[PDB]
Amino acid sequence: TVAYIAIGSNLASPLEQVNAALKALGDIPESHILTVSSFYRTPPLGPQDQPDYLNAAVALETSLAPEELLNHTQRIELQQGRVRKAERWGPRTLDLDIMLFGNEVINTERLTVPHYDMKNRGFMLWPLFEIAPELVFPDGEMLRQILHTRAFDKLNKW
């Protein structure tokens, strides 16, 4: 299956965090990276009192089930010092989100796919568009159309 993963980091040298994450992602069993987007430097969306983010997107081919892939992405986050609390949108060393998993629609307590807010986030959609410009969501909406329609500002590079 082809899964699209979003990467975010705004603490403890984001470039080192993301290069380390790419290596660890390549190490997941039964999986291999297909493509990596450019690295973008984005102002925080949501709480503004935190450093700018390094955001990227990766296409991964995997034969793991969606929740098994999650187990590995959460292990990598933890390995790189991610400590979550119920208070959610603060700074973090590493954030690995599953944006899409094949054409699956998943709605469980652990996993909501497509990512519940990705159509509202330019820092997820632009990097994704760079690696999969003709992508179509499970609901039939085209990625290119969402970007053209919403007029999201373009992103700067890291």
Ligand X SMILES: C[C@@]1(CCc2ccccc2)Nc2nc(N)[nH]c(=O)c2N=C1CO
Ligand Y SMILES: Nc1ncnc2c1ncn2[C@@H]1O[C@H](COP(=O)(O)OP(=O)(O)OP(=O)(O)O)[C@@H](O)[C@H]1O
Q: Is 123 in the site for ligand X (CB under 6 A)?
A: yes
Annotation marks residue 97 as catalytic: yes
Site string for ligand X, 44-63 (x = CB under 6 A): xxx------x-x--------
Q: Which residues contact 57 (CB under 8 A, 6 or more apart)?
A: 4, 5, 6, 7, 36, 37, 99, 124, 127, 128, 130, 131
Q: What angle do CA 75, 17, 23 make, to 5 degrees?
A: 65
Binding residue (CB under 6 A) for ligand X from 56, 94, 95, 114: 95
Q: Is 112 in the site for ligand Y (CB under 6 A)?
A: yes
Write out the catalytic residue numbers. 82, 92, 95, 97
Could you list the residues that contact ligand X (CB under 6 A)? 8, 42, 44-46, 53, 55, 89, 95, 123
